[PDB]
């Protein structure tokens, strides 16, 4: 069974994995205002990955006989100054998610909860792919700041990641 | 182009189609606490339909050269008294969504916006299927109030509706 | 929910879509008395389309939580003077059905019933095909009034429309 | 050729095979008001069998060089007290159809009409299947009068008989 | 039947859907003078869509028993100052077509013509795709005004839309 | 390169190959008023052949580094006295097209333009098929002037030529 301090902190992180998806849906509503429908299709596909991260804390709380509480999801930022700053704010956010998985994992070792630190092993290994898949694109945008020719070619090459959920809906 | 009173009211309804999906995810977190994993798989599949409803207001605002603003999604109710009251509160919610589509459609006729009232024709025809797909199950639960044998058989027959997004995630 | 004046008028039109099928079955009993078994197979296939029109008012009343009342279907006319007058009386009947769909659609706009006027949109678009599929054949019979050679060739070309229900029964 | 007393009595029975189908469509409008959409899909499929019975008297009158006259189809009963009494009134009706086939068959032997008594041999052999397919379900409802668990399981097992005409319309 | 004021206004719009196709054939004769054979293959494929729009007013007038009158198609503009101004003049033209569909749809509601306003529902839903498929390309040309590298890459990516009629002719 | 007198005369003939298609679309709007939907489907398929003739002068002017100018297409005749006179006016028109190809071909030999007279060799060989495909049908209508039985059988046999563009649009 989950203790009161670990069930509350797994519920706070399930709220952060849904505010993540409600932030990558406020960036896709920003890039598709600029006409960058390959950046916007990159961000929507990341807002469906992050829903799949919150259905893993959800299925873990009901495997360990807990109870999921849903709080309010706050207002995400609307606009950024440039498509560079919209990825420096998505990479600063992925270092805020990982900072809070490491304080879940340092919480499960204090309470001697071996079946939770075994579960956070998936999210520690997967945030290494999340920080690097954004730092790749963030370094292609510092490679082209006053060059619309390259930004036109980043829109197309990132359009290979298309969301699969509108194909079902 | 969308007027200021119609772009604001299409943005308020995109917030209601995402609070819908954040309400059917607070019912799936209720039925899966009772051990009713067929009611909980019904509700998660409805929380992925309602995300697909908010990606239609989203793609309409960027077809009509607007701008999507995302507000905060409030706290949904946690627990209900019974699995009957958890569907009387999902049917009262589907009569609140439809009350606000009819005040979008009575707004687009006041502003003489023929390309928006043509778009809400999909959501008027589809809320007739949403109010009836809940009133079917709500009438099977008033048919069995002190009968766990039938509630055990509603859990299995509603488990045919499984969410397709965990199969991709 | 359907109001008392709209549930009564949807029930009157479900009685007209079954008297339609009981009129095209009194024309098929007329053309097959003259030996015109291609005109008679045209009319029986229209009496199975019109049953399919009354199973759409029927499924709409039980989607909107109503109650279908069945009145008596009156006696259709037995004989007409010619196979021309048996289509001038089927085209005058298809202008009587459409006159009553337009008084359902002008009733749903008076009561501000957006989910019924959305439903009658199918029957407004489909009576345009019904008035034209009879006016085609009615204009081929004014093209041949004292010519049995052409009436022998309208019997065969209209025999391509065969009823599918005797193939199952 | 058909005599005047046998053409009139074959036309009266073609009116009873269409009031049959307009009675099983007033029971399907009753069971689908109670939410029993497997009883209602049983009754609609019987209202398409009984139309196929009246297209056999119809094709026999035009094989024997007669003339089909269509009278008015009266008002069927609207509601019954229970789903038991809605099958005791469909079994009392199938003993009224068979009572009138036996008075057609005792009419064709009085007029020495061997080609009509040969034709009613199909309807005598088929009403034995009609009285027994209703007495099966009528005896499953006297087996469960104060048991909604079994009535919930008769709704599903009778839903295997689905009408084929809405699949074409 | 179509009234004299609605048959005249449906005939004026069939003349505008053929002057549309005779304008997108004067832009394809402009882009293929500049050597932009991907812009020119985009415009020819739009001049075959707009012929398909005038064969829908044509088939509607002969479903409603009218008469199509063909007036003269005026001289389209020959040259524009740039490939930007050749899309600002095709987007100003698609806001002139839609302004005249909305004055057909506001004409069919004044004459209480429900079967014409039901037909213009296709053209209201489809001009939303026409104004947006031009505003996409018009915003890619304001993204590159003094950049021939990007205009060379818009010629190729718009060459995926090839006209199907020279493949048959 | 094309001279000024040959570029102007190739542009005048591209205007005649589009007024041809706007004449066979005023005959299809005449035959489909008489209910002759096989004559009307013959004429629409000829109005798509003649568009394919004007896309050959168009692709030749941009192979020879010219410039296509589009003038106005005048009003075609609305009605003729009979379906005989609607083919005597389409055969008199096909002798007016061929009279002007022969004055293009006698113009390219005066200017010693061997690459244009080589191109008009296709249109000289193809107008022999156009004058004969109309003179076949024109001689079947002088074979039946007071015979609606044969005119009913010319409508069906000419309906094998169906336009392929509405199948794509």
Residue numbers in the entry:
A (entry chain A), B (entry chain A), C (entry chain A), D (entry chain A), E (entry chain A), F (entry chain A): 1 to 169
Give sentences from the paper:
We show that a nanofluidic sample support with well-defined geometry can be used to prepare cryo-EM specimens with reproducible ice thickness from picoliter sample volumes. The sample solution is contained in electron-transparent nanochannels that provide uniform thickness gradients without further optimisation and eliminate the potentially destructive air-water interface. We demonstrate the performance of this device by high-resolution 3D structure determination of three protein model systems, apoferritin, T20S proteasome, and tobacco mosaic virus. To validate the suitability of cryoChips for 3D structure determination, we collected datasets for three test specimen (P. furiosus ferritin (ApoFtn, 480 kDa, O), T. acidophilum 20 S proteasome (T20S, 700 kDa, D7) and tobacco mosaic virus (TMV, 37 MDa, helical)) that we selected for differences in size, shape and symmetry.
To probe the resolution limit of data collected using the cryoChip, we merged data from three chips filled with ApoFtn acquired on a Titan Krios equipped with a post-GIF K2 camera and processed it in a standard single-particle analysis workflow. We used 2D and 3D classification to select a final set of 21,238 particles (O symmetry) from 815 micrographs and after 3D refinement obtained a reconstruction at an overall resolution of 3.0 Å displaying visible side chain densities. The reference model for 3D alignment was generated from the data itself using the stochastic gradient descent method, suggesting that the quality of data collected from cryoChips is sufficient to allow initial model generation even for samples considered difficult for reference model generation. To examine the compatibility of cryoChips with the condition to form vitreous ice, we evaluated the fraction of images containing crystalline ice by manual inspection for the presence of ice rings or crystalline reflections in the computed power spectra from all images. This led to a fraction of 86% (815/945), 75% (91/121), and 52% (43/82) of images that we classified as containing vitreous ice for ApoFtn, T20S and TMV respectively. For comparison, we also acquired datasets for ApoFtn and T20S on conventional holey carbon supports with the same acquisition parameters, yielding reconstructions at an overall resolution of 2.4 and 3.2 Å. This leads to B-factors of 217 Å2 vs. 178 Å2 for ApoFtn and 490 Å2 vs. 328 Å2 for T20S determined for cryoChip and holey carbon datasets, respectively. Analysis of the orientation distribution showed increased abundance of views along the fourfold rotation axis for ApoFtn, indicating preferential alignment of particles with the SiNx membrane. To quantify this concentration effect, we estimated the particle concentration in the nanochannels by segmenting and counting ApoFtn particles, and measuring the channel volume from the reconstructed tomogram.
